[PDB]
Amino acid sequence: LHKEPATLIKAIDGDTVKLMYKGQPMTFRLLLVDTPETKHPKKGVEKYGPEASAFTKKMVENAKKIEVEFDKGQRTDKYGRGLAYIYADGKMVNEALVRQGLAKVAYVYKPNNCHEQHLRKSEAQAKKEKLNIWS
């Protein structure tokens, strides 16, 4: 795996960000995590949805460097979204959300599972500390 540079365009939700990558706008979905959501007229807004969305927004808007890391399987999903691990100044946004109790580890589909072990470790700790969703 290798990290490549990208530029923020806009944060959309806890689990989705729009970036300029290789000179083109794309929507990215964060690999291996599921955050409560604010969109959708499904349930509309779920508990901890606004919080997860603000967490992601502040972490990417305040970064001096954004990097994307593709896994070793497919790189886009059926909606055209990029599938990746996103780093802000060297820290993985995906892991940060799970460590804070603002995401659960979710949808693990081989072979895009390279950091699965590491994120399950972070999720166990957040549950143990009874944070946010696990409160």
What's the Cα-to-Cα distance from 45 to each of 5, 14, 42, 73, rounded to whole Å? 32, 12, 9, 32
Specify whether 75 is catalytic: no
Binding-site residues sit at: 15, 34-35
Which method was used? X-ray
List CB contacts of 25: < 8 A, sequence separation 6 or more: 9, 18, 19
CA distance 94 to 15: 8
> Which domains are present in the chain?
1-135 (2.40.50.90)
The whole-angstrom distance between residue 108's C-alpha and the CA centroid of its chain comes to: 14
Binding-site residues for Ca(2+) sit at: 15, 34-35
CA distance 62 to 89: 9
**Do the Cβ atoms of 105 and 79 come closer than 8 Å?**
no
Catalytic residue among 29, 51, 67, 123: 29
**CA neighbor of 49 nearest in space, from 39, 62, 63, 59:** 39
Specify whether 81 is catalytic: yes
Q: Give the CA diameter of the chain.
A: 42
**Do the Cβ atoms of 55 and 14 come closer than 8 Å?**
yes
Element (DSSP H or E) covering residue 98: helix 93-99
Specify whether 37 is catalytic: yes
**Do the Cβ atoms of 110 and 31 come closer than 8 Å?**
no
Catalytic residue among 46, 69, 81, 120: 81
